[PDB]
Amino acid sequence: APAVPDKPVEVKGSQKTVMFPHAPHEKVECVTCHHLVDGKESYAKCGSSGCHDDLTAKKGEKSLYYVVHARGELKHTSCLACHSKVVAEKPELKKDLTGCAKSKCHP
Ligand code: HEC
Ligand code: HEC
Ligand code: HEC
Ligand code: HEC
Numbered sequence: 001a002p003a004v005p006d007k008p009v010e011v012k013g014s015q016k017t018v019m020f021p022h023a024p025h026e027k028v029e030c031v032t033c034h035h036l037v038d039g040k041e042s043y044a045k046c047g048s049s050g051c052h053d054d055l056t057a058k059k060g061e062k063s064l065y066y067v068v069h070a071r072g073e074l075k076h077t078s079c080l081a082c083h084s085k086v087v088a089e090k091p092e093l094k095k096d097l098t099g100c101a102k103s104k105c106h107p
Pocket of ligand 2: 034
């Protein structure tokens with residue numbers, strides 16, 4: 001596996017960029033996010049060509065927005081799906097981890 005980033009990295013949407021910090025996620029398996037594709041490890045950017053490269057649609061497996069924000073029955077864990085579970089146990093973090101504004105993702 002490539003080196004984990006040791007600084008926040010950009011996650012570019014069509015119109016917003018959110019910084020993603022690996023450090024809070026150190027106990028999360030890499031593969032939870034960097035899921036296998038065709039049975040093989042991959043660490044390419046989520047919005048890479050051939051992956052979640054629809055940066056404007058809100059739904060569909062190609063939609064970057066959907067795979068970040070869906071709280072529905074997806075095939076891998078999205079940011080908001082896991083954060084919803086975290087804030088159930090740590091409700092002081094509700095705005096920080098799930099808010100659409102003034103959150104840690106969208107300050
Ligand atoms: C979800 C909570 C993650 C966990 C756990 C790990 N990574 Fe990650 N990584 C994640 C995102 C959302 C991004 C940004 C991707 C983008 O589309 O811009 C990254 C970035 C990386 C990179 C750079 C390449 C890339 O995919 O952009 C590397 C090399 C990387 N991450 C490695 C890595 C490893 C080795 C992890 C476990 C120790 C790991 N990440 C965990 C999301 C998440
Ligand atoms: C191309 C090599 C990809 C990269 C890099 C990433 N994803 Fe992906 N993702 C890809 C496929 C072919 C699929 C569908 C098959 C499956 O394995 O379920 C997915 C699926 C997801 C999902 C589920 C979406 C659904 O509709 O159920 C999520 C939540 C997801 N991917 C997230 C995700 C993230 C956060 C990534 C960067 C860290 C990422 N994927 C990389 C192809 C590829
Ligand atoms: C569980 C499997 C997670 C997934 C998937 C993602 N995140 Fe997460 N995130 C998780 C935890 C346990 C925490 C720490 C909560 C605590 O107890 O402190 C976080 C934290 C963040 C933060 C806040 C960092 C800070 O400012 O302190 C951010 C900005 C964040 N997470 C972003 C993020 C994104 C964009 C994700 C999908 C690519 C994502 N997280 C997935 C657990 C999990
Ligand atoms: C971190 C866990 C997030 C929280 C909380 C919320 N959003 Fe988010 N959002 C996040 C990322 C990683 C990105 C960039 C990648 C992508 O394209 O999804 C975004 C981006 C947006 C955008 C812009 C989309 C674009 O194409 O530029 C919008 C409109 C947006 N996010 C809305 C939104 C809402 C409604 C939220 C509350 C439920 C919310 N976000 C929370 C990460 C995170």
